[PDB]
Amino acid sequence: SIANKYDNTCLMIAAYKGHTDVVRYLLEQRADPNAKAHCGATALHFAAEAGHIDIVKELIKWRAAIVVNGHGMTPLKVAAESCKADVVELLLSHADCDRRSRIEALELLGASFANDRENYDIIKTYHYLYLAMLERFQDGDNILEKEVLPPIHAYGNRTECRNPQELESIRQDRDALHMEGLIVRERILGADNIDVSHPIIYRGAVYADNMEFEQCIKLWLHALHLRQKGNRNTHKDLLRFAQVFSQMIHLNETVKAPDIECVLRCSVLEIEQSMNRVKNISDADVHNAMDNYECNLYTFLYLVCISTKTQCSEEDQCKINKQIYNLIHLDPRTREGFTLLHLAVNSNTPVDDFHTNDVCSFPNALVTKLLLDCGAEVNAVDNEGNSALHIIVQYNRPISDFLTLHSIIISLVEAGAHTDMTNKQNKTPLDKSTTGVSEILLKTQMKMSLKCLAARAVRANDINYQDQIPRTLEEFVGFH
């Protein structure tokens, strides 16, 4: 019975595989199968999850007990969720049981097969939903009506069915049997801290295969909320979320509505904030979270990639642009320097999962332009001492994307890029640039002033700057 940190005892993990021979010895050794796990499970609850009728035989011989864990699910409903009708048959044959969970399990059992990713059955969908429904109307004295749930754009304004006549009339439409099942799962498991995300992903993935992209987006939208109620990281859901747009936008199916993208980005706004807030929660443990944090940062670019391609009235971008400045004012700080403007211009190598294509290109002209259109800080400097123009000159294949290389420099000289800048080891823009043709364009855009490089003479002499210069001018010594 001495268990792990998650309170899984030795015999808890024995029944996990299903080898009844070991369990047969264990129970005959006067060991209790009803020890509670970290959530509160028991060997019977594991047997309910495992669904091995062989092991349960010894369990019934040694009178295991029913325990509800911290998630709030009965083992009888666990067999219903596990889609083990035979184990349901045995437990319905069990001497001690509560009919309250039986109806609750059977309704979820019917919704279990309909929403099942691999073992889906529409025959078991109607057969067990009807049997459970008749259990509600088994008695005329007590009339149990399946409570309806509020209509949802994700749910397409559907209410939970209340009578067999509704169930009998909808045996024809397979999706209606699919569609009703989600309401049953949502209504019952809402109180429990138990996710229902897996069915919705299955529904959307099939809809993704059925060109029903309108429904899958909205279904996942609520599934985005379902992850939020459970305080469960949506970044993995967001990881696949972006990749969905990655295909069909390339296929140019429909790019009609960017106002939805506002909802998507407003959704990931606090997610990154929470991701940033998670970074505030832990310091050493967020080492791997940085990559996920970087991934969220990458999604920003990919979202911008979508945002760049989609076009609409300026008001939508006004909705979009507001939260952008939030990200701007929020710290974009990244390790080894490399803020977003640094990462937007350089070779954005961490791209994959169909993002290594024309949708997300390394030279990205407009995205860098639009970042400045948002109004970020032009003169940010990396810990290496690098500038915005310190990277664009360090560009291979100048002939390739020649117009883009020219176009970026057009805006960068505007909005205040200091023409020649040296930090740490001396790095003039002429020095960092290694391609002659690029340097020519740099020569074309120079503007001659007096102090902008006259001060540089003082470093050759290096007299005491402090207490000899106005307050604001002291940095020009520092810059050079």
Binding site: N4, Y6, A37, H38, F46, E49, N69, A205, D209
Partner: peptide
């Protein structure tokens, strides 16, 4: 042609809904 998430079960926390 369309892949699926691994959803590999953590051996220590055997409960499906509770994952790390």
């Amino acid at each position: 042609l369309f892949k699926e998430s691994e959803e590999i079960r953590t051996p220590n926390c055997n409960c499906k809904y509770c994952s790390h």
